[PDB]
Amino acid sequence: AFYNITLRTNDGEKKIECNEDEYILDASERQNVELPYSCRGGSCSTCAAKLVEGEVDNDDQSYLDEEQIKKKYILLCTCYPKSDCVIETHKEDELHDM
Ligand code: FES
Ligand code: NA
Ligand code: NA
């Protein structure tokens, strides 16, 4: 199924949908909502975001440790939505300065 993702970016709030079988980064990009990234493989911190509400499957990621995951951080390049979500983007620095 598809879920509606509310992206709270550094340039306002944007509404985009994403198939539960695809990554949020790719879905966002085709709907013209540019998000940060670099490796696009789940092993770095560039695409870091924070889950405000909703369920996701970000098990394909590998950079974030359990402490960061518990704090709701997710890497959008490898994150599947599992319900409607409200996500804050461009959180790499926040993550870095925890
Ligand atoms: S762009 Fe590197 S983990 Fe997402
Ligand atoms: Na960019
Ligand atoms: Na450092």
* Deposited experimental method: X-ray
**How many CB atoms sit inside 10 A of residue 49's CB?**
30
Cα 80 to middle of ligand 2, angstroms: 20
Answer yes or no: is 44 a known binding residue.
Answer: yes
Binning the chain into helix, strand and coil, the percentages to the nearest 5 are 20, 35, 45
What class is the 1-98 domain?
alpha beta
Question: Cβ < 6 Å from ligand 1: which residues?
Answer: 37-44, 46-47, 63, 75, 77
Domain locations in the chain? 1-98
Residue 98's contacts (CB-CB under 8 Å, 6 or more residues apart) are 68, 71
Test site for ligand 1: of 38, 58, 90, most ligand atoms within 8 A of the Cβ = 38
Query: What tokens appear for 84 in the block?
Result: 């409607």
Tokens 């509606």 correspond to 4
